[PDB]
Write an enzyme that holds these catalytic residues in place. Structure first.
Site, PDB file in Angstrom:
ATOM      1  N   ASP A 102      41.081  54.631  28.835  1.00 37.03           N
ATOM      2  CA  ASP A 102      40.698  53.147  29.842  1.00 37.03           C
ATOM      3  C   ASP A 102      39.496  52.740  29.710  1.00 37.03           C
ATOM      4  O   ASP A 102      38.744  53.014  29.446  1.00 37.03           O
ATOM      5  CB  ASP A 102      41.222  53.907  31.348  1.00 37.03           C
ATOM      6  CG  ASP A 102      41.318  52.839  32.284  1.00 37.03           C
ATOM      7  OD1 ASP A 102      40.810  52.114  32.326  1.00 37.03           O
ATOM      8  OD2 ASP A 102      42.583  53.024  32.679  1.00 37.03           O
ATOM      9  N   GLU A 121      50.135  49.664  31.934  1.00 35.55           N
ATOM     10  CA  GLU A 121      48.413  47.787  32.103  1.00 35.55           C
ATOM     11  C   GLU A 121      48.992  47.032  30.736  1.00 35.55           C
ATOM     12  O   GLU A 121      48.979  46.157  31.335  1.00 35.55           O
ATOM     13  CB  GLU A 121      47.617  48.187  32.514  1.00 35.55           C
ATOM     14  CG  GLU A 121      47.653  49.025  33.411  1.00 35.55           C
ATOM     15  CD  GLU A 121      47.439  48.022  34.665  1.00 35.55           C
ATOM     16  OE1 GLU A 121      47.554  47.794  34.923  1.00 35.55           O
ATOM     17  OE2 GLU A 121      46.693  48.685  36.252  1.00 35.55           O
ATOM     18  N   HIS A 181      45.886  51.110  42.032  1.00 29.96           N
ATOM     19  CA  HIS A 181      45.463  51.128  40.387  1.00 29.96           C
ATOM     20  C   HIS A 181      43.891  51.401  40.225  1.00 29.96           C
ATOM     21  O   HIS A 181      44.133  52.060  39.017  1.00 29.96           O
ATOM     22  CB  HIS A 181      46.289  49.475  39.892  1.00 29.96           C
ATOM     23  CG  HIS A 181      45.595  48.543  39.077  1.00 29.96           C
ATOM     24  ND1 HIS A 181      45.656  48.129  38.771  1.00 29.96           N
ATOM     25  CD2 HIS A 181      44.477  47.899  40.131  1.00 29.96           C
ATOM     26  CE1 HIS A 181      44.878  46.630  37.900  1.00 29.96           C
ATOM     27  NE2 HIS A 181      44.129  46.867  39.559  1.00 29.96           N
ATOM     28  N   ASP A 192      45.822  54.066  29.067  1.00 26.87           N
ATOM     29  CA  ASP A 192      45.846  52.159  29.844  1.00 26.87           C
ATOM     30  C   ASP A 192      45.481  51.932  29.091  1.00 26.87           C
ATOM     31  O   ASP A 192      44.828  51.474  28.245  1.00 26.87           O
ATOM     32  CB  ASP A 192      44.805  52.419  30.898  1.00 26.87           C
ATOM     33  CG  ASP A 192      44.569  51.020  31.753  1.00 26.87           C
ATOM     34  OD1 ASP A 192      44.776  50.304  31.374  1.00 26.87           O
ATOM     35  OD2 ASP A 192      43.935  50.999  32.358  1.00 26.87           O
ATOM     36  N   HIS A 233      48.765  50.885  36.897  1.00 23.49           N
ATOM     37  CA  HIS A 233      48.028  52.433  37.208  1.00 23.49           C
ATOM     38  C   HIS A 233      48.038  53.251  37.942  1.00 23.49           C
ATOM     39  O   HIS A 233      47.656  54.779  38.012  1.00 23.49           O
ATOM     40  CB  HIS A 233      46.634  52.698  36.332  1.00 23.49           C
ATOM     41  CG  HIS A 233      46.460  54.044  34.736  1.00 23.49           C
ATOM     42  ND1 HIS A 233      45.300  53.697  34.311  1.00 23.49           N
ATOM     43  CD2 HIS A 233      47.086  55.276  35.019  1.00 23.49           C
ATOM     44  CE1 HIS A 233      45.104  55.009  33.599  1.00 23.49           C
ATOM     45  NE2 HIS A 233      46.194  55.468  34.230  1.00 23.49           N
ATOM     46  N   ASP A 278      39.351  53.900  37.525  1.00 20.80           N
ATOM     47  CA  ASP A 278      40.707  54.420  38.282  1.00 20.80           C
ATOM     48  C   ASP A 278      40.270  54.846  39.501  1.00 20.80           C
ATOM     49  O   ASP A 278      40.634  56.041  40.101  1.00 20.80           O
ATOM     50  CB  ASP A 278      41.201  53.554  37.395  1.00 20.80           C
ATOM     51  CG  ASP A 278      41.768  53.278  36.495  1.00 20.80           C
ATOM     52  OD1 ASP A 278      40.793  52.744  36.739  1.00 20.80           O
ATOM     53  OD2 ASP A 278      42.539  53.719  35.663  1.00 20.80           O
ATOM     54  N   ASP A 308      44.244  49.377  28.360  1.00 25.01           N
ATOM     55  CA  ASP A 308      43.480  48.339  28.444  1.00 25.01           C
ATOM     56  C   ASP A 308      41.925  48.850  27.783  1.00 25.01           C
ATOM     57  O   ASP A 308      40.939  48.593  28.124  1.00 25.01           O
ATOM     58  CB  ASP A 308      42.702  47.108  30.030  1.00 25.01           C
ATOM     59  CG  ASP A 308      42.610  48.541  31.074  1.00 25.01           C
ATOM     60  OD1 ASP A 308      41.835  49.842  30.434  1.00 25.01           O
ATOM     61  OD2 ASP A 308      43.203  48.100  32.372  1.00 25.01           O
ATOM     62  N   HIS A 347      37.921  51.781  32.081  1.00 22.91           N
ATOM     63  CA  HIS A 347      37.659  51.713  34.344  1.00 22.91           C
ATOM     64  C   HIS A 347      38.223  52.939  34.387  1.00 22.91           C
ATOM     65  O   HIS A 347      38.661  53.930  34.132  1.00 22.91           O
ATOM     66  CB  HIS A 347      38.525  51.256  34.437  1.00 22.91           C
ATOM     67  CG  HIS A 347      39.047  49.169  34.179  1.00 22.91           C
ATOM     68  ND1 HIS A 347      39.573  49.005  33.605  1.00 22.91           N
ATOM     69  CD2 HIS A 347      38.366  48.270  34.594  1.00 22.91           C
ATOM     70  CE1 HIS A 347      39.629  47.526  33.571  1.00 22.91           C
ATOM     71  NE2 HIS A 347      38.701  47.523  34.156  1.00 22.91           N
TER      72      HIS A 347
HETATM   73  N1  LIG Z   1      37.702  48.485  39.192  1.00 22.06           N
HETATM   74  C1  LIG Z   1      38.489  47.520  39.464  1.00 22.06           C
HETATM   75  C2  LIG Z   1      38.063  45.868  40.136  1.00 22.06           C
HETATM   76  C3  LIG Z   1      36.905  46.117  41.217  1.00 22.06           C
HETATM   77  C4  LIG Z   1      35.931  44.849  40.846  1.00 22.06           C
HETATM   78  O1  LIG Z   1      35.104  44.985  40.252  1.00 22.06           O
HETATM   79  C5  LIG Z   1      39.702  47.652  38.673  1.00 22.06           C
HETATM   80  C6  LIG Z   1      40.574  48.610  38.029  1.00 22.06           C
HETATM   81  C7  LIG Z   1      41.366  48.036  37.297  1.00 22.06           C
HETATM   82  C8  LIG Z   1      42.436  49.054  37.402  1.00 22.06           C
HETATM   83  B1  LIG Z   1      43.105  50.339  36.114  1.00 22.06           B
HETATM   84  O2  LIG Z   1      44.704  51.134  35.657  1.00 22.06           O
HETATM   85  O3  LIG Z   1      44.113  49.208  35.085  1.00 22.06           O
HETATM   86  O4  LIG Z   1      42.153  50.699  35.028  1.00 22.06           O
HETATM   87  C9  LIG Z   1      39.281  47.782  41.052  1.00 22.06           C
HETATM   88  O5  LIG Z   1      40.025  47.068  41.222  1.00 22.06           O
HETATM   89  O6  LIG Z   1      38.990  48.968  41.745  1.00 22.06           O
HETATM   90 MN   LIG Z   2      43.661  52.069  34.642  1.00 25.87          MN
HETATM   91 MN   LIG Z   3      42.093  49.823  32.146  1.00 31.37          MN
END
Ligand SMILES: N[C@@](CCCO)(CCCC[B-](O)(O)O)C(=O)O
Ligand SMILES: [Mn+2]
Ligand SMILES: [Mn+2]
Ligand SMILES: N[C@@](CCCO)(CCCC[B-](O)(O)O)C(=O)O
Ligand SMILES: N[C@@](CCCO)(CCCC[B-](O)(O)O)C(=O)O
Ligand SMILES: [Mn+2]
Ligand SMILES: [Mn+2]
Ligand SMILES: [Mn+2]
Ligand SMILES: [Mn+2]
Lengths: 306, 306, 306
Positions: free
Chosen positions: A120, A273, A137, A228, A97, A124, A230, A122
């Site tokens: 998503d 992703e 990402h 995403d 991402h 991000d 996910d 998340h």
């Molecule tokens: N928030 C995460 C995990 C941090 C540990 O809790 C995950 C980011 C996922 C990236 B995506 O593109 O999949 O949403 C990060 O790496 O910043």
């Molecule tokens: Mn993402």
């Molecule tokens: Mn994600």
């Protein structure tokens, strides 16, 4: 009605190998024929080859591959900007991402009033000062939001990036795994989101109504859909690097894409992703890739009623 | 904000071996760290060893292990009453659902105006005269409900039990496998429930709203959450003794727990009927135990939005 | 309350082998015992043996087994007519969906004001001029629909059929795989339907309310429920010939059936397209057959609350 397809096989926004094969997997699942059948005029840019950067050492002993992610995104941005200027709706296949940094920058270059629907698990939206992984990402939105720039330090290879959208111009759908500093950021800048909890309460129909009311309630704006994979429940999209239980159902994902299409405003779409290497079977990889195609097709007009 | 954790490895409320390994399984799924992370101050009472009863013959040639179930619950109630009196919200890990006789009796001993949210595929309100199985895990509510007193014979080992809940003080959520005399009881005493059908109609948000209006709409009351893992669809919680198709989704389960947390009134929680031995695979056992941990963690403040 | 059960082991409405074993699979899943338990007085007609037609050549170099499908349906219609005449609610087990031609015709003979609830992933309303497969199981509505009769050619074996349904008298639920000519037909004749998309928006409770308002809002009518097992998501009903992702959940299917039962007007029911041979495992076959029994049972009063 013309669609450009860009393969962006990037993996350096994170640490799990194989997400660079996402664009191939998606193409193999029949993306191009599906788009043609809806009447899309297609330009396939193939899969980009991004220029590497020698000695791309950690930034601040934490952020991984910053110069590579910066340069690949600069290059991607140029391709996207060019394609939009030639009148294509831009589909970018990831890849992790972090490439939304490039697609949104390039898109915003001559569509500066664009708005963003970020689907998503998340947010991000960690910054280089809040990330606990160092993985870009999970930071892309922090580089794009103008309200945040006093809080975002300058990474090597990122100087070309100018923050291009406001916090009122992005809406999240599907959130369920948010870091505390991201939660602080979303509240502090009043960024609107619909977590899985809000979907449980409101239902996906009302979520899309309120999303569009917030973004295009007062004026038409080109829509950038950053999706995403996910966002979907891991039972539906297992082949991805950060799966989180309790995601969108198939029907919910289609309904989102359908409403995106129905606005008539879709101008760019990221599908990121998908990592076929993380499937425990070929069936798991293919179902993930097939779902990705379903999203893209529904976003460009495939319906469930004929 | 303090939480007591009591393992109640009891299986004699029913006939299937293995449910006594529920507490260990739930602990191994990382329960304690999850509660700690939420800011819960923890007291672990460990897993109780219940006193056996010699020659615990069937009651009335039907009801199995009555004295063992009676005594184990008496001992459990003692531990529960003491922990609640010392200021802990009490989490009891089962074990079969007959241990709710002890956790609710013990909880009521300190908090007599408590109310009960019973999340289950089953009503668990058969009496010794209606049960067709003889399994006490399918009768515990009958011993607790004041209005049922005159219909409930005295069992050996049960004399210590004082019915402590009025029929208006319990609400069921998730019902889908109800015996005809249980249905009669629910109607005849005007006991409120939301079956899977009601959830289908109202949605889980309205279900929770109405549940709290019935229980705490007039005054604040401590809440006892008695959660049978079989409330969830068998696909999500396969490792359990009496699975019934068409159950709560993961998201619905989390939503129930979140609303429980949001009242600020949760005083005790049972998580019962996880039986690792009934898993077809180690994966199935772990997903059931992990789900149990998610329920408990959400009930004490874990959110899906950070 | 009397229920006749008719096995209709027909497969010639389509090309995949095995759907002729649908009725036996459904019986093996305990249909008769389930119906008895609800108080149904049962008459079992067993599995009909249909008269074969020699040299049943393609019609118009496209349409498969027309005389066989015509004749089997005439014979079926006679059996359905007779059972309904003798006071039975008629359950017909398929077999492919082309046999609805027979059950609806037979039913309409004594109950001409009947209405039809068609629960299906597909519209089954192609005509001999619009079908692209040549399979009659995807055309049965076209032969039944009064408004269409000028656009439907006369097939060998089909002369006995008199269209008996008006377009205002059929409602679809669950559509998600509709051919464009079918879509044209649905809009052009203003045939009402609730696609998976409509269910995502309205929820199944509203869908059933509106269905009945359309069909019986003005007057009581005998209801014909034609239920294609493929209405259900393929994860739930994998043993079927044309599975389409994003279908009804178990709970939604039960709710539809419960609402059918609650009208008090159910007069005939088809349960078609269970093909045990298309299961990749015996477990998949059995779960499909079990789901079929659940639908039929709920349509005749099985509840989720006791
Ligand atoms: N928030 C995460 C995990 C941090 C540990 O809790 C995950 C980011 C996922 C990236 B995506 O593109 O999949 O949403 C990060 O790496 O910043
Ligand atoms: Mn993402
Ligand atoms: Mn994600
Ligand atoms: N109602 C049952 C089944 C009777 C036969 O239909 C099951 C009770 C389940 C106990 B639980 O704690 O799991 O909900 C009983 O044993 O009473
Ligand atoms: N519409 C189909 C597919 C045509 C190719 O897209 C399928 C009909 C399904 C029949 B059913 O009884 O299962 O709904 C047809 O054969 O007409
Ligand atoms: Mn239960
Ligand atoms: Mn229970
Ligand atoms: Mn059909
Ligand atoms: Mn069908």
């Amino acid at each position: 009605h013309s669609v450009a397809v860009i393969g962006a096989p990037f993996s350096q926004g994170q640490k799990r190998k194989g997400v660079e094969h996402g664009p191939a997997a998606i193409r193999e699942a029949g993306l191009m024929k599906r788009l043609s059948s809806l009447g899309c005029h297609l330009k396939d840019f193939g899969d980009l080859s991004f220029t590497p950067v020698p000695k791309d050492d950690l930034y601040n002993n934490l952020i991984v591959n910053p110069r590579s992610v910066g340069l690949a995104n600069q290059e991607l941005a140029e391709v996207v900007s060019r394609a939009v200027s030639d009148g294509y709706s831009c589909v970018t296949l990831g890849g992790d991402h972090s490439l939304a940094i490039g697609t949104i920058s390039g898109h915003a270059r001559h569509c500066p009033d664009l708005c963003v629907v970020w689907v998503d698990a998340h947010a991000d939206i960690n910054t280089p000062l809040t990330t606990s992984s160092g993985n870009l990402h999970g930071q892309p939105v922090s580089f794009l939001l103008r309200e945040l720039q006093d809080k975002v330090p300058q990474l090597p290879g990122f100087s070309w990036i100018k923050p291009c959208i406001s916090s009122a111009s992005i809406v999240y759908i599907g959130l369920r795994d948010v870091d505390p500093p991201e939660h602080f950021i979303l509240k502090n800048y009043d960024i609107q989101y619909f977590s899985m909890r809000d979907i449980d309460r409101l239902g996906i129909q009302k979520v899309m109504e309120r999303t569009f009311d917030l973004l295009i309630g007062k004026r038409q704006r080109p829509i950038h859909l950053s999706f995403d994979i996910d966002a979907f429940d891991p039972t539906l999209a297992p082949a991805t690097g950060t799966p989180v239980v309790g995601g969108l159902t198939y029907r919910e994902g289609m309904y989102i894409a359908e409403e995106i299409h129905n606005t008539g405003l879709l101008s760019a779409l990221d599908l990121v992703e998908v990592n076929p290497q993380l499937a425990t079977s070929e069936e798991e990889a293919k179902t993930t890739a097939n779902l990705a195609v379903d999203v893209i097709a529904s976003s460009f007009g495939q319906t469930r009623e004929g």
